[PDB]
Design a binder for these strands. Structure first.
Lengths: 205, 302, 117, 117
RNA sequence: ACGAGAACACGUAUGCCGAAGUAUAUAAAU
RNA sequence: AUUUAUAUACUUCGGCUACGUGUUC
């Protein structure tokens, strides 16, 4: 038995509006009051996209039951079966380098873009204030990989790296079709935290 | 899949941010035709380090009501602030009762929102397919925001009401300069509305726009000045779209007339009710005696 | 404190609002207060920032200038006493009281919005 | 007290609900009451906090402003008499009665939710 | 020299499991 | 320089203290 730590940083390439708490603010901590990316959003995006990238039938589409590797990697355990999630996806925290960068550059922690609602053949406008995490922000994230069966570590990390890649080429959060929610992954480090499993030949882009 | 789209701004482009700059933070130079935005922090810190903050306060706080004495340059000159010093307290410059500002990013660089770019695309798609469930086929079309745009391609422009007889409007809008090249990435989730499909659709919108509305403003000095310079006979083969503000409503004549009357009823009822008993947007450059219409730019896919 | 409600009821004269004041005359006003609202709500300590003091000064600038433009704006800004409360906020350097003033002005805005032609 | 149930039945007119009122028009409303619900349920003593008094005032602010926006909201807020009960809660400084008002409004919300197109 | 006297309702195990705060509608007209 | 000010839909769905064990010598 062992555990494997997947750590890195997420930078934010365009606007980010998770807006889980909602003029319509974003999810923000209450110890230090900076925006965060809820791990639930990370997991939902990753699950939906990696699931759709392989097969997805209408009967598969029915009740959140999907192909065997996702149901292994993220865990379902309803269909009279034994399976727990093998990834522990945590929350993301607006890192310290970003703190100091925006503090000494006097750049806000969030923009506020204004929107409008032009009605057809009526040309009457309906205003809208919305708030989003600024560009260039970086958060730190950690994944914990429990090792349940020795012989599937390699394939599971191949699927994980494909998930990361496909996420890199897709958005995160809300209103992604209007151009906010792009992210990119860097500075990935892999370490064995508990046990006697080797983490050298293992890489993620 | 995914594609990179280039935008080449034929004319002034305006994407309203809702900020109307007031009688402050500018120096309109009559004799040199440049307006100088002023950094708030550096200007006030200069006011404090030279103990001019107090005099500046009573100057601004007592409005002389004299139109020649209701600016910022006169306030600065009354304190005899050096021209070299004044030029340093200028954050950024562009070549004015009010000034409407653009949208800007977290670092105050300007970018094209995904809403406006997609919004004009949606205006085009609705016309081509008469709204063939175009509301549903949004959620599977994705546009990313543009990359930042350096200041060097921003300038002031007056709104001109170009009719058979030209009229000047009182107010000014900031715009992205001519021939600026702009990048953004497109994402396609439905193959049915392919990239060539989008291009042909918006081109067809432009052609219908021409033969409905762009032929009508002929015999006008600026009108024929703009249309020929833009080469709109060849532009019918070119991929053009009006973005954001500054474009007319039209972006049969009887139904158009009735619709315009209703829209103007809803709009100008508070200021000019003359419509109930009854106009093209353009910019004229003093530098070149060349009038451009606000909105159009080339779009190319890859 | 609802004394704003009382003054607004006392300001509905035979109808007009503050003798020619409209909510859109207030555009720049609530925009400035809301902008300051954001920059202050970001802050942590109640001890105000001193560029925040500069920003409050700039807000008073906007007040005196709006009053200069329009007579109804002048009447509104004088009777309901924006001006001493801004002065005491500048004198006090307290954040929570700044938000108290913010809710005050927003109360004025909302009540006037419901109290119109 | 179910007189809310009686008024809601009396408000199903020939069908419409409060003549154009929808539960989503109530979004900001129940959000504010629930937010106050949390901050009050955290408290210990029945003697209300005085920033809690300020928060109740702010709630009344939201009430008039919502009424100002929409006519159906105005009709709803007037007939079912949110407004005197808020006034007496402000006058009484009692927590348990505040939660009584909370379940009152929640009763309205739930009954209306079952009472729809 | 009391139908009394000794006598722990006690010991092992959780609120878990899966779920994206989403999906639409250009800060516009003179 | 003159009108809006977030809008309608959904506001937790599914699946409901087992064993040693009670009594006497």
């Amino acid at each position: 038995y062992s555990k494997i730590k997947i750590s890195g940083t997420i930078e934010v390439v365009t606007g980010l509006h998770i807006g889980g708490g909602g003029d319509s603010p974003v999810v923000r901590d209450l110890q230090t009051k900076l925006p965060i990316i809820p791990g639930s959003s990370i997991k939902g995006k990753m699950r939906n996209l990696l699931a759709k990238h392989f097969g997805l039938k209408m009967k598969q589409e029915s009740h959140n039951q999907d192909d065997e590797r996702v149901l292994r990697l993220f865990g379902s355990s309803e269909k009279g079966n034994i399976q727990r999630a093998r990834l522990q996806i945590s929350d993301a925290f607006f890192s310290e380098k970003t703190k100091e960068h925006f503090a000494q550059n006097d750049i806000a922690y969030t923009e506020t873009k204004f929107e409008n609602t032009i009605n057809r053949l009526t040309a009457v406008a309906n205003p809208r204030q919305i708030e989003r995490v600024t560009r260039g922000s970086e958060f730190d994230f950690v994944f914990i990989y429990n090792v349940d069966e020795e012989s599937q570590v390699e394939d599971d990390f191949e699927n994980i790296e494909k998930a990361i890649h496909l996420l890199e080429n897709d958005y995160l959060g809300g209103g992604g079709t209007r151009g906010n929610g792009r992210i990119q992954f860097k500075d990935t480090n892999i370490e064995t935290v508990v046990g006697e499993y080797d983490s050298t030949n293992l890489k993620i882009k | 899949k995914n594609y990179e789209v280039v935008i080449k701004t034929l004319g002034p482009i305006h994407i309203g941010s809702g900020q109307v700059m007031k009688k402050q933070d500018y120096i309109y130079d009559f004799y040199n035709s440049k307006v100088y935005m002023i950094n708030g922090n550096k200007l006030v810190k200069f006011l404090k380090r030279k103990n001019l903050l107090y005099t500046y306060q009573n100057f601004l706080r007592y409005p002389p009501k004299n139109p020649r004495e209701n600016g910022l340059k006169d306030y600065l000159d009354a304190q005899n602030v050096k021209q070299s010093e004044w030029e340093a307290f200028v954050s950024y410059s562009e070549k004015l009762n009010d000034l409407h500002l653009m949208v800007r990013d977290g670092q105050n660089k300007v970018y094209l929102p995904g809403s406006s770019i997609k919004g004009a695309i949606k205006t085009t798609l609705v016309s081509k397919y008469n709204n063939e469930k175009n509301k549903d086929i949004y959620s599977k079309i994705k546009v990313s925001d543009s990359k930042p745009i350096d200041e060097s391609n921003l300038a002031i422009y007056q709104k001109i009401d170009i009719n058979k007889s030209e009229k000047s409007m009182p107010l000014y809008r900031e715009c992205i300069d001519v021939n600026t090249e702009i990048k953004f990435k497109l994402t396609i989730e439905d193959e049915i509305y392919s990239i060539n499909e989008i291009e042909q659709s918006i081109q067809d919108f432009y052609k219908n726009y021409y033969d409905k509305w762009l032929v009508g403003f002929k015999e006008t000095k600026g009108g024929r000045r703009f249309a020929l310079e833009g080469g709109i006979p060849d532009v019918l083969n070119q991929n053009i779209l009006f973005l954001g503000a500054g474009t007319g409503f039209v972006s049969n004549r009887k139904q158009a007339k009735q619709d315009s009357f209703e829209i103007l009823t809803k709009k100008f009822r508070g200021t000019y009710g003359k419509m109930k008993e009854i106009a093209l947007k353009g910019t004229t450059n003093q530098s070149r005696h060349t009038s451009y219409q606000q909105g159009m730019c080339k779009v190319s896919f890859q | 404190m609802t004394f704003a409600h009382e003054v607004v009821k006392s300001n509905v004269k035979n109808q007009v609002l503050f003798n020619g004041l409209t909510t859109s005359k207030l555009r720049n006003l609530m925009e400035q207060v809301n902008r300051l609202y954001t920059i202050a709500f970001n802050s942590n300590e109640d001890q105000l920032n001193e560029e925040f003091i500069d920003e409050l000064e700039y807000l008073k600038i906007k007040f005196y200038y709006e009053a200069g433009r329009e007579k109804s704006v002048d009447e509104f800004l004088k009777k309901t006493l924006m001006f001493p409360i801004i002065d005491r906020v500048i004198k006090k350097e307290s954040k929570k009281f700044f938000l108290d003033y913010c809710k005050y002005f927003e109360a004025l805005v909302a009540y006037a919005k419901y109290y119109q032609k």
